[PDB]
Structures are given as structure tokens and as C-alpha cells.
Amino acid sequence: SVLNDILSRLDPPEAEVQIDRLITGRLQSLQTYVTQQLIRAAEIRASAN
Amino acid sequence: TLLALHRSYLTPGDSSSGWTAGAAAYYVGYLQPRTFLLKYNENGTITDA
Amino acid sequence: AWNSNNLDSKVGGNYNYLYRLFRKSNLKPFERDISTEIYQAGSTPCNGVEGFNCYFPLQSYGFQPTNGVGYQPYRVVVLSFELLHAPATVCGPKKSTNLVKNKCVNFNFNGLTGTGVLTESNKKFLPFQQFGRDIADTTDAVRDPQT
Amino acid sequence: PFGEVFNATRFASVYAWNRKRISNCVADYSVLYNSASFSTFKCYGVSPT
Amino acid sequence: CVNLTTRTQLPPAYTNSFTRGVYYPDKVFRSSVLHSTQDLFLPFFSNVTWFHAIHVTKRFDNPVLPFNDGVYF
Ligand SMILES: *[C@@H]1O[C@H](CO)[C@@H](O[C@@H]2O[C@H](CO)[C@@H](O)[C@H](O)[C@H]2NC(C)=O)[C@H](O)[C@H]1NC(C)=O
Ligand SMILES: *[C@@H]1O[C@H](CO)[C@@H](O)[C@H](O)[C@H]1NC(C)=O
Ligand SMILES: *[C@@H]1O[C@H](CO)[C@@H](O)[C@H](O)[C@H]1NC(C)=O
Incomplete structure (x- = not known):
């Protein structure tokens, strides 16, 4: 490793x-972490709106 | 396990019958593969698992 | 691997080296069996007869000077080692250097390579453990062998 | 003690191979490589140099 | 070989051992962290077989026990 x-x-x-x-x-x-983060970010973004 | 014999004057006085060993004990437990969760203390000792 | 043809050539001949021909099951990795027995195949087991369907455990070599060099005997030594299990006894030719503290430096400690500022730490290493690690299993502390 | 294994009076037969464990010693592996008296020096998992 | 006489034959007495035999799995030392290691260990709450070498009458037994895949004494 x-x-x-x-x-x-x-x-x-x-x-x-x-x-x-x-x-x-x-x-x-x-890549998995970045992709997951964007999806999480959108939920937060929606919450912020 | 190896053994200890508490030979005295009251015993017959030979290798076949002359012995007063007294109290003694041991425990044997077999080991096998398992998954363990270990908790480590701040000092470093394993408090619990 | 290497040849020692001269050493393996004798006027009388050499046949003190024997390789097994037959065995019921495959030998395990890094396992040696020197048991003297004769392989038995199917029915009519020989039971020491070494008769039909029964074989002695090993066959002698044919190393001879007249023997062709291509097929002639080779001396082979296998060197095997495993690492990071414990403190390594068999270090190489490398020469040590003076310890530097609180300055960023490149440090090779007992075959471990990383890069960070080294500072004295209060954690109590129980006499037994050489390394150290953090929550995410990254090296955090080490004990200098000399120090 | 690299030398004893490499130069020795006798080499064992395969059926009963000789295994030696070397410990607490500093050995210069490069000198063996330097001599080049051995036809095959393939090394697996570790660079010879 | 020399022998010994008048031994008492009885069925083995079994007692529970719980949360015992946990040992440091490896050389690394960690603080305030939980790590799971697949290392052989006495399973917790696994029966252990008590033995007696106590004369208290004519009782003395030190019988051979198989060591299979790790033994705890
Ligand atoms: C192992 O055997 C080799 C080959 O015989 C030895 O290498 C020779 O050593 C002598 C004495 O130091 C030198 O003068 C020669 O030049 C070397 N080469 C040969 C081919 O003889 C080696 O010294 C021996 N012992 C070991 C490695 O422990
Ligand atoms: C653990 O370290 C603390 C430091 O305050 C000390 O008081 C305690 O005695 C230590 N215990 C053990 C078991 O080392
Ligand atoms: C306890 O030991 C007995 C011995 O007869 C065995 O039958 C049983 O399976 C053991 N149980 C546990 C929980 O170890």
C-alpha cells in the first residue's frame, strides 16, 4: 500500500x-468522493434555497 | 504441563508413591479465528474489546 | 543459481542427491518432506515390496563430467524474506546519521520512508512496540533504534 | 553469515532441503550481485540493485 | 520410566471464561482509536476445561491435551 x-x-x-x-x-x-460531494452539495443547496 | 511434587518426611520415600503434592490447578481454552473490535486507551492499553 | 560442474564430477561418480518421483498429493509451499517411503498407486499396495504399482520415494541423479553441461547440475539458493512485520534485524550496508529535531527532514528509519518534522513526543510506548499510528492508520511516531 | 550458505561443503537433496534463518546481522547484498559468477540472479518483488 | 499410583478418575469440570485472552494483536500502538483485527483469539464466553492436580483423596492428574490452532493456558 x-x-x-x-x-x-x-x-x-x-x-x-x-x-x-x-x-x-x-x-x-x-472520483467517488467528488461525485458524492456534489450530490450532497445539491441537497444542501436546495436546503439553502 | 510440567509438575511439582511437595516431597516430605511423612511420605513413603520413593519415586512411585512418595509425594504430597497438594492443591494445584490450570485452565485450557482453545483458540480459533475471530474478528475483534479493540478499544485503545489514551495511554495505549486495551481497556475493552 | 550457478554451476559447480567440477565439484559434482567424481571418478567414482556422485549419487548422494535424490529428487522424488511420485507422491500422492502435491507438496505444500515452503514445506519439506524427507520421510522415507515408497509411493503406492491404486490397488495391490506393495507394503514395502516396492513391487508392481509401488515405488521407492526418490530417484538418484546422473551428474557426470562426461555429462553434457546444458543438462549438468546447477547449484541453486533461494533467498526469501518478508518485511514490516517487526523490527528488522538484517539491515543493509547503510551508515547512520545524527538525529535532527524540529526541522523538516527526509528520514529512513528501519526501512520506513516518510517526510515530516520530527519532534519529541510524550506518548508512552510500552517497551514492546516499535511504531505508532493515528486514527486513520498513518505512521505518527517511531523509536530510533540507537536513540 | 551469507558466506557459509553460499560456499559450503555440501548441498542438500531436494527431498530434504536445508533452511537457514539469518538474524541480527548486517549483510551486504550488493557484493553477491557484484561478483557475477552466478548465471541466474532473477529477483522477484525486490530490485536486486 | 517412573510412575505414580492411586489416581482418581472423574469427568472434567468446565467453567466459563469471559472477556479474557484479549491480547495486543500486533506491534503498532494507537491511542483513542478502535481497530478491528482478524487475529486468532479465544472467543468470548467460550468454555475452558478446569483440571485438578490437588490431592484433596489421592488425586493427581496432569493429562495430555491437544494443542490445535492455538491454545490458551
Ligand atoms: C565464496 O567463494 C567465492 C568463489 O570462490 C569466493 O570469491 C573469491 O574470494 C577470493 C578470496 O577473497 C578472491 O581472491 C577471489 O577473487 C574471489 N573469486 C573467486 C572466483 O575465487 C568468496 O571469497 C567466497 N566466500 C564468500 C563469499 O564468503
Ligand atoms: C495513564 O496516564 C495517566 C496520565 O495522567 C496516569 O495518571 C496513569 O497512571 C496512567 N495509567 C497507566 C495504566 O499507565
Ligand atoms: C460448554 O462446554 C460443554 C462441554 O460439554 C459443551 O457441550 C458446550 O457446547 C460448551 N458451551 C459453550 C457456550 O461454550
Whole structure:
């Protein structure tokens, strides 16, 4: 899980593959949070109106 | 478990019958995989689970 | 892996190394069985006869000097290790540096890499635990091995 | 003690392989890599360098 | 091997052990937080088998017990 550990214990060529899975997952996690936040924001926006 | 024998002068005086061991006890409980919720104290001890 | 052809070549010949041919079930990972027995197949078990459908547990090698190099014996050593389980005894060649406190720095403590200001902390580490973590499971405290 | 395992009087047969646990020691892994007397040095999960 | 004589044979006596055997699962230390770990532990309120080595008449027993997947003593 730790990004540094992978960087520390793997080759530069080897990091194309391992880091990529981590990055893809994290973007999805971020995407879910942002999407959820907008939906929550709308409810609050409606409440504010 | 290993055992302790309280050998005295009143005993017959041999390895087969000469012993007055007295009170002793132990409990054995088997362990299996389970999920535990652990609460940690401010100091760091596990108060309850 | 490596070759030691010269060491494995004897005038008399070498046959003290044996690999198993047959076994009822697959061997478990990182598990070794040196039991001396003979594999039994189906009916008519040999019961030590080593007769039809019964086999001795292992077969001898054929390492010979005349033997072709391509198929000639290799010396193979497997190095296996696991990390972050506990304090690591087997550190590498790296040389230590003086501790710096309350200044942002790059610190490698026992194979752990992160970046933050380091400051002395009051928390009572019970003698047993090396690390520390916060509510969201991120490293928060460490104990310098020398310090 | 990297040396004892690497240079030794005898190597065990596969049926009963020899396992050695090395602990509380500092070992320079790079020197083994530096020698290059071994045909196969594939390393998995950890960069050799 | 040497032996011992006049032992009393009785059915085992069982007593409840509750909220016992909880132990620190791993090396990390945390404060004011709750973490759930899938580590082998004595299940809470699980029966434990009491044994007696007390003479109080001619009573002395130290029988072998299987250790399977973790034992608590
Ligand atoms: C393991 O065996 C190797 C190969 O024989 C040894 O490497 C040699 O060491 C000697 C003495 O230091 C050197 O003069 C040679 O140049 C090295 N190479 C060879 C091919 O002999 C090594 O010293 C031995 N022991 C270990 C690694 O513990
Ligand atoms: C916990 O820390 C507090 C600090 O006020 C101290 O008073 C108490 O004795 C400590 N208890 C244990 C069990 O360490
Ligand atoms: C308690 O021990 C007895 C032994 O006969 C067993 O039958 C029973 O299942 C156990 N119950 C619990 C709750 O551990």
C-alpha cells in the first residue's frame, strides 16, 4: 500500500506496473468522493434555497 | 504441563508413591479465528474489546 | 543459481542427491518432506515390496563430467524474506546519521520512508512496540533504534 | 553469515532441503550481485540493485 | 520410566471464561482509536476445561491435551 515502499524496493522499470494499479484505484476513490460531494452539495443547496 | 511434587518426611520415600503434592490447578481454552473490535486507551492499553 | 560442474564430477561418480518421483498429493509451499517411503498407486499396495504399482520415494541423479553441461547440475539458493512485520534485524550496508529535531527532514528509519518534522513526543510506548499510528492508520511516531 | 550458505561443503537433496534463518546481522547484498559468477540472479518483488 | 499410583478418575469440570485472552494483536500502538483485527483469539464466553492436580483423596492428574490452532493456558 505505501507508495514509498514500492518506490524504495522496486526497479524503475518495475514501477510502471505496480504504481499504476495504485494510481488507478486512488483516482477512482477520489472520483467517488467528488461525485458524492456534489450530490450532497445539491441537497444542501436546495436546503439553502 | 510440567509438575511439582511437595516431597516430605511423612511420605513413603520413593519415586512411585512418595509425594504430597497438594492443591494445584490450570485452565485450557482453545483458540480459533475471530474478528475483534479493540478499544485503545489514551495511554495505549486495551481497556475493552 | 550457478554451476559447480567440477565439484559434482567424481571418478567414482556422485549419487548422494535424490529428487522424488511420485507422491500422492502435491507438496505444500515452503514445506519439506524427507520421510522415507515408497509411493503406492491404486490397488495391490506393495507394503514395502516396492513391487508392481509401488515405488521407492526418490530417484538418484546422473551428474557426470562426461555429462553434457546444458543438462549438468546447477547449484541453486533461494533467498526469501518478508518485511514490516517487526523490527528488522538484517539491515543493509547503510551508515547512520545524527538525529535532527524540529526541522523538516527526509528520514529512513528501519526501512520506513516518510517526510515530516520530527519532534519529541510524550506518548508512552510500552517497551514492546516499535511504531505508532493515528486514527486513520498513518505512521505518527517511531523509536530510533540507537536513540 | 551469507558466506557459509553460499560456499559450503555440501548441498542438500531436494527431498530434504536445508533452511537457514539469518538474524541480527548486517549483510551486504550488493557484493553477491557484484561478483557475477552466478548465471541466474532473477529477483522477484525486490530490485536486486 | 517412573510412575505414580492411586489416581482418581472423574469427568472434567468446565467453567466459563469471559472477556479474557484479549491480547495486543500486533506491534503498532494507537491511542483513542478502535481497530478491528482478524487475529486468532479465544472467543468470548467460550468454555475452558478446569483440571485438578490437588490431592484433596489421592488425586493427581496432569493429562495430555491437544494443542490445535492455538491454545490458551
Ligand atoms: C565464496 O567463494 C567465492 C568463489 O570462490 C569466493 O570469491 C573469491 O574470494 C577470493 C578470496 O577473497 C578472491 O581472491 C577471489 O577473487 C574471489 N573469486 C573467486 C572466483 O575465487 C568468496 O571469497 C567466497 N566466500 C564468500 C563469499 O564468503
Ligand atoms: C495513564 O496516564 C495517566 C496520565 O495522567 C496516569 O495518571 C496513569 O497512571 C496512567 N495509567 C497507566 C495504566 O499507565
Ligand atoms: C460448554 O462446554 C460443554 C462441554 O460439554 C459443551 O457441550 C458446550 O457446547 C460448551 N458451551 C459453550 C457456550 O461454550
